[PDB]
Structures are given as structure tokens and as C-alpha cells.
Amino acid sequence: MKGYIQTVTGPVKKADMGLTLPHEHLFNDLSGVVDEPFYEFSHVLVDKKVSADIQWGLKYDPYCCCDNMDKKPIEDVIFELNNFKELGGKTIVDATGSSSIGRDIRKLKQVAELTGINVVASSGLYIEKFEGKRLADDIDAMAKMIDDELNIGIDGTDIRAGMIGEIGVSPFFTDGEKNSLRAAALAQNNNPYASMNIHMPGWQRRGDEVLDILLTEMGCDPAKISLAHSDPSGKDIDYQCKMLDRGVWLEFDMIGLDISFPKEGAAPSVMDTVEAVATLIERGYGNQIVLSHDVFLKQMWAKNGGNGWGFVPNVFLSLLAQRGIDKTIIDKLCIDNPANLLAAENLYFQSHHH
Amino acid sequence: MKGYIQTVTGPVKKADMGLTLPHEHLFNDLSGVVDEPFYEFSHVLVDKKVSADIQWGLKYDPYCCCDNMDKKPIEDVIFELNNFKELGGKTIVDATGSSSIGRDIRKLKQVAELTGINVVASSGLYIEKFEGKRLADDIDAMAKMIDDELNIGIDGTDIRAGMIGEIGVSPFFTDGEKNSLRAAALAQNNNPYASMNIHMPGWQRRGDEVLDILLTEMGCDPAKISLAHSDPSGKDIDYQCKMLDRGVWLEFDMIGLDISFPKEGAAPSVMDTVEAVATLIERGYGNQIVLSHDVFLKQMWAKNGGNGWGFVPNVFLSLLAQRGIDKTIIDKLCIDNPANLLAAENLYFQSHHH
Numbered sequence: 001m002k003g004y005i006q007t008v009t010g011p012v013k014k015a016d017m018g019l020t021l022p023h024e025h026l027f028n029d030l031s032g033v034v035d036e037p038f039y040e041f042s043h044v045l046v047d048k049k050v051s052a053d054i055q056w057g058l059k060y061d062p063y064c065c066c067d068n069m070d071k072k073p074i075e076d077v078i079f080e081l082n083n084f085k086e087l088g089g090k091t092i093v094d095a096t097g098s099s100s101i102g103r104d105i106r107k108l109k110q111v112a113e114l115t116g117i118n119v120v121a122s123s124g125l126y127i128e129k130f131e132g133k134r135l136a137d138d139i140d141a142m143a144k145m146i147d148d149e150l151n152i153g154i155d156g157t158d159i160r161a162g163m164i165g166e167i168g169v170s171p172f173f174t175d176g177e178k179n180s181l182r183a184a185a186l187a188q189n190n191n192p193y194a195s196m197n198i199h200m201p202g203w204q205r206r207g208d209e210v211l212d213i214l215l216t217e218m219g220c221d222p223a224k225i226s227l228a229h230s231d232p233s234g235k236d237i238d239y240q241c242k243m244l245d246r247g248v249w250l251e252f253d254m255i256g257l258d259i260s261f262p263k264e265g266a267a268p269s270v271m272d273t274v275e276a277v278a279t280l281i282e283r284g285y286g287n288q289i290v291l292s293h294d295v296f297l298k299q300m301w302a303k304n305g306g307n308g309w310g311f312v313p314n315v316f317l318s319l320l321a322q323r324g325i326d327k328t329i330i331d332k333l334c335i336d337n338p339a340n341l342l343a344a345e346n347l348y349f350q351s352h353h354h
Numbered sequence: 355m356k357g358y359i360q361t362v363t364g365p366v367k368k369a370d371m372g373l374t375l376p377h378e379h380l381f382n383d384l385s386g387v388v389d390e391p392f393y394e395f396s397h398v399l400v401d402k403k404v405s406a407d408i409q410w411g412l413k414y415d416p417y418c419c420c421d422n423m424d425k426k427p428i429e430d431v432i433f434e435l436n437n438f439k440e441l442g443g444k445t446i447v448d449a450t451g452s453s454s455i456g457r458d459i460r461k462l463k464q465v466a467e468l469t470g471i472n473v474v475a476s477s478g479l480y481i482e483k484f485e486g487k488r489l490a491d492d493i494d495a496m497a498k499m500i501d502d503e504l505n506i507g508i509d510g511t512d513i514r515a516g517m518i519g520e521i522g523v524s525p526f527f528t529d530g531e532k533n534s535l536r537a538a539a540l541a542q543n544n545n546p547y548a549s550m551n552i553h554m555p556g557w558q559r560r561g562d563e564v565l566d567i568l569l570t571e572m573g574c575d576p577a578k579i580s581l582a583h584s585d586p587s588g589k590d591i592d593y594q595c596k597m598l599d600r601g602v603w604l605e606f607d608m609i610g611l612d613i614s615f616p617k618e619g620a621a622p623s624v625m626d627t628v629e630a631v632a633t634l635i636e637r638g639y640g641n642q643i644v645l646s647h648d649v650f651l652k653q654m655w656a657k658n659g660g661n662g663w664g665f666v667p668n669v670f671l672s673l674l675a676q677r678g679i680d681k682t683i684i685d686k687l688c689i690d691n692p693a694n695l696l697a698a699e700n701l702y703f704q705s706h707h708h
């Protein structure tokens with residue numbers, strides 16, 4: 001009851017969230033993991049500024065380009081956000097939950113004030129590759145940190161997070177990552193409105209072991225848990241329905257990503273995901289799906305020839321409609337659904353303790 | 355023997371062609387078939403100038419945008435060509451073979467002179483949708499026209515074509531289109547160095563009936579025939595090998611196209627085509643494959659965030675190398691192969707008659 005989201009400028013009631021994107025990165029910095037150029041052509045990308053003129057290459061080796069991986073200028077973030085705003089965009093979640101990946105709580109507040117968009121910050125440790133020993137801390141300590149960031153503030157400020165995540169599960173699902181997941185669960189069970197977004201290794205099928213921890217062991221409310229990067233398992237209907245049957249949300253947050261990673265594999269096409277999401281809706285699971293773009297690289301901005309933050313509510317929703325999905329469901333996918341995931345009260349834990 | 359290509363500034367010997375793109379459009383104009391906006395979002399595209407900022411939409415409804423479909427400014431063509439030149443690009447084929455689709459023989463010559471790139475013009479009637487009654491002419495008359503454009507010149511000039519094509523076979527393969535194919539065959543059999551490029555309905559499997567006409571009926575040299583738009587049949591190995599076994603070239607000319615057409619279907623991904631082409635090479639057919647981009651819309655230019663004319667020799671070739679194809683074959687795919695298709699002498703017809 002009384003569902004709401006804690007934004008960077010205060011609480012917003014569930015009914016007031018409107019068109020919402022539940023998994024994006026407004027301010028992140030991946031500067032400490034620029035990769036060496038992977039291919040013979042990649043060397044020319046390395047020191048170049050991201051623009052439309054190098055999409056040809058960035059779509060095959062995004063991580064070799066320093067600029068692509070560097071901090072995001074506020075001017076550029078606001079320009080791209082004004083795109084979403086023009087379509088009736090009202091709320092956006094920054095899933096940059098850790099200093100490991102450049103969370104910038106003060107710029108998030110700045111952008112909310114300038115644009116009037118509801119901006120939700122996150123708290124959560126990422127994969128061991130970025131976090132190192134931070135995942136080896138006591139689970140209670142890690143949980144306390146997340147609890148403080150949700151209820152008191154971040155980085156010495158009074159600006160609070162509204163989501164737990166994105167919690168890092170790597171393709172190696174390390175013992176530290178498992179510890180991190182347990183800490184996130186403890187924090188969630190102390191915070192009646194907080195959803196938990198899990199970064200999944202999308203080209204793997206690790207959902208059952210993740211949910212054995214969150215659901216079976218830690219006793220979390222499945223309706224407050226979302227599995228990120230579900231997109232690359234979209235052809236695997238049996239796996240996806242198995243997860244949905246455990247009561248969690250599947251998040252297709254790579255819509256319009258349009259990049260091939262030299263290691264981890266190539267992102268599904270928009271049409272691939274249209275078919276997956278449409279088939280899940282036909283199977284009765286429309287009320288358990290959320291959609292986003294996971295903008296996390298400068299190449300993804302529309303001003304650079306990427307798809308930006310308008311693509312899901314404008315293009316993808318139109319594609320679903322052409323595929324014959326009913327308008328009533330389509331209208332829920334980017335409004336009611338993310339509002340319920342992010343803001344509905346937990347059914348198992350309705351008190352916040354000290 | 356003595357293989358060569360007739361370019362817009364004169365003959366170039368086969369050995370001097372270098373890095374060659376055998377299927378592109380430098381100057382074309384599709385202004386008379388702008389489609390109505392297909393989707394709810396498409397209306398904003400209609401009157402906008404193509405830029406990186408509307409790729410989001412043009413990738414799903416390219417033909418509704420008037421600017422995208424209009425004539426190509428020479429400044430823009432030269433900028434994009436200088437990209438290819440920088441990679442050692444030496445020769446490019448404009449497959450705009452008809453006034454129906456805006457062939458501009460004088461601008462082709464202009465660009466060759468300004469850039470030093472060997473530019474090959476084409477002669478050939480397109481699909482009935484564009485050509486109408488022009489396909490209902492006497493086959494001998496149609497053949498004479500193609501013969502004159504190869505040997506005397508185009509549009510009152512002394513600038514000649516060097517390729518027959520792209521010959522229009524629509525998804526309806528009309529009687530007119532069949533007539534057009536026969537005229538192209540007659541012209542080829544009178545022109546010992548001219549290759550014939552057939553626009554195929556790529557999401558269909560019409561190759562056997564096309565080749566029954568060209569090969570069985572008209573007696574053409576299969577080694578001078580290329581089937582365009584083979585890309586969307588790349589998963590259909592049995593069909594593709596059946597065509598290759600008849601001795602013709604398969605052209606994968608949609609590499610880096612990255613567009614979904616609302617009717618005809620979505621283009622294969624670059625990685626899809628990497629796998630198809632690699633598997634054909636592993637099957638022994640590497641000497642029967644050519645590669646191109648089919649740049650035909652302003653959205654495809656690199657300056658707009660498309661992949662431009664550098665993508666095949668830079669990115670695709672690197673991808674094939676990562677997939678473990680041998681360098682000796684990779685070096686042939688964009689040099690020896692297109693030179694042989696375009697410039698080798700016909701084995702069946704070695705005299706030009708009047």
C-alpha cells in the first residue's frame with residue numbers, strides 16, 4: 001500500500017510515475033577497464049571522440065575507445081533526456097549503483113532539477129571484476145551500506161537511492177558475488193518498497209541458482225526482484241518461463257543496444273526481442289515484463305546515431321503493436337509494469353527496522 | 355584473356371582494379387516511391403533531413419523519409435568515397451542501371467575525376483514496379499539498348515557502362531521481368547567482358563528459375579553472372595550451394611545494411627553473414643563469393659552513423675579472420691574475386707558483334 005519511489009529529489013507516488021525506464025545509466029565511468037583494441041581496425045577508434053562517424057567500428061569494439069568509456073557530460077545527458085521527455089517520459093532509473101562504475105549522485109540530482117524528470121539512483125555492488133575485495137566484506141556490513149544509501153544518503157549527501165542494484169552476477173558467479181547477492185537480499189528485506197535489479201550474465205542461464213539464493217534461501221518477495229539482461233535468453237522460452245513461474249520480473253533492458261561485444265557475444269536484434277516479448281505476453285506473462293535500453297556508452301546516445309532513450313516507448317511499442325499485441329497490454333508495459341516493480345510494497349516485509 | 359573493366363573514364367585492366375566494391379549506388383533517386391509512414395512513430399521522419407539523430411527511426415521505416423530517398427549530393431558522395439580511398443579502395447561499381455532509379459552518368463564521371471577512384475556505371479532495367487511498360491518492349495530492342503550503353507555511351511554522352519545490371523527480379527517475377535532478363539542475356543552474349551548482376555528477391559528462393567532462364571535457356575556463362583542480395587538466404591546452405599554448383603557468383607551485398615523493412619523483412623546481421631560466408635568458404639566455394647554494402651539510402655552513409663563504404667574491407671574481413679578463415683582467401687574476397695567477376699572474359703562468347 002501507498003507505493004512510491006524515492007527519487008533524488010524526494011518521494012514520488014506510484015500513480016505519478018508515468019512513462020518510466022527502469023534500467024539505464026545516466027552517469028557512469030568505465031575508464032578503468034578500457035580494453036586493448038581487439039581487431040585490426042580497432043586501433044583508429046582508441047583515441048577518437050565518439051561520433052556518428054565511427055559507429056561503423058564502435059558497434060564491434062565498443063570498449064577499446066576511451067571517450068566511449070569515460071564520464072558523461074551533463075550537457076550530453078540532458079540533451080538525450082529531453083528526447084525522452086518529449087514523448088511524455090516522466091521517470092528514469094540510473095542503475096549505476098556503485099562508485100566502482102562511476103555513480104554521480106550530485107549530477108543525478110542536478111539533472112532531475114533541470115529537466116523535471118523523476119530520477120531514481122541505485123545502491124548495489126557490481127561484479128567482482130570492478131569491485132574486488134569490496135565483495136569480501138561481512139554480509140551485514142554490505143547490507144548496512146545499502147540500507148544507509150536508501151534511507152540516509154549517498155557519498156556524504158542527503159540524496160538517497162530508490163533501487164537496490166544493479167547487483168553484479170558475472171559469468172563466473174564468484175563467492176564474492178554470491179555474498180553481494182545475500183547482502184542485497186538482507187537490505188531488501190529491511191526496505192518495504194525497494195526493488196532489486198540483478199545484473200545477469202545474459203548469455204548464460206544462471207537464473208535458477210540466483211533465485212535459489214534470493215528466493216529459497218533469503219526469502220525475498222519475487223515481485224520485488226528483476227533479472228536484468230534477459231534479452232539474450234529470449235529464444236530460450238523454457239528457461240524464461242521457468243524464471244517467470246518463480247514469480248520474478250524479466251527485464252529486457254538491451255532494446256536497441258545494437259552492439260556486438262568481442263567476448264561476451266552479440267546483442268539480440270530488436271526484432272528478436274519483439275518476438276520474444278510478444279510470445280511471453282501470448283503465454284500470459286505480460287504483467288511480469290519490463291523494458292529498457294541500458295544506455296551505458298556514449299555510442300548509444302541518439303546524438304551519436306544510437307537509439308537513445310526514446311526508442312522503447314516509440315519504436316519497440318509500435319513494433320509490438322504491428323505484431324498484434326493488444327493496446328491495453330502495450331500501454332502497461334512502460335507505465336504500470338515498471339511502476340509496480342519499482343514502487344509496489346513488498347508482500348513479505350512491510351516494516352523498515354533500525 | 356586481357357580482362358578489363360570499362361569505367362566512366364575508360365578501360366582498366368583486371369590486375370589494376372585493387373580493392374573493389376562490386377555493388378553500390380553512388381547516385382540514385384527513389385523520390386517517386388516515398389512510402390506513407392508505416393508506424394505510429396514514422397510521421398516525424400517524413401520531412402526531416404537524414405542525420406545521426408533519426409537513425410533510431412530510419413532503421414525501421416527508411417522509405418517514408420523523403421530526404422533519404424532523394425538524389426545524392428556530389429559533396430556527400432565524395433566525402434564517403436574518401437573513406438574507402440583511405441583504406442586502399444581503388445574501384446567501385448554503381449549498380450544504378452536505369453533512369454527509373456536515377457542513374458547519373460555525368461556525376462559518376464565527375465566523381466571518378468575528382469577522386470581518382472575507378473567508377474564503373476551499369477546498364478540494366480530494374481523491377482516492373484519502377485519500369486512499367488519499359489519491360490514490355492521487344493527483347494531485341496532492350497538488348498540493343500544495353501549493348502549501346504556498354505559500347506557507345508549513356509544518355510547522349512560518350513560515357514559507357516561496364517556492367518549489366520542490376521536486373522530487376524521482383525518477388526512477383528513478372529513476365530516483363532523475365533523479358534528483361536532475356537534481353538540482359540542477349541546483351542551479355544554480345545559483350546565478352548560484361549558481367550550481369552541480378553537483383554534477386556532476397557527473402558525468396560527464386561535462383562533456380564532465374565538460372566533456368568540465364569543458363570539453360572539463354573546459354574550464358576555462369577562465371578559472368580552474379581546473384582545480388584544473397585545475404586537473406588545465408589542460413590539456407592542447401593539453396594546457396596545449389597546455386598553455387600550451377601557455377602554462378604553469390605553476392606552478399608547487404609553487409610552492414612542494418613535496416614528492417616516494414617514489408618520485405620529485416621536484413622541479416624553482420625554476424626549472421628560472417629557465419630554464412632565462412633561456412634561457404636569451408637565448403638570450398640570461396641572463389642565464387644563477392645561482398646558489398648549496397649549503399650542506396652542516405653542513412654547508410656558513415657557521416658550519418660551508417661556503415662559507409664569502408665565497412666566490408668575493414669570490419670567484415672576482420673570478423674572473418676577472427677572466425678578463423680585463412681588470410682590467403684580473405685585477401686582474395688575483395689580483390690581477386692570481384693576483379694574476376696567483373697573483368698574476366700566470358701568463356702562462351704569472345705566476340706562483340708554489330
Ligand SMILES: [Mn+2]
Nearest residue numbers: 166199200228
Ligand atoms: Mn548490467
Ligand SMILES: [Mn+2]
Nearest residue numbers: 024095166294
Ligand atoms: Mn546496466
Ligand SMILES: [Mn+2]
Nearest residue numbers: 520553554582
Ligand atoms: Mn537490388
Ligand SMILES: [Mn+2]
Nearest residue numbers: 378449520648
Ligand atoms: Mn543495389
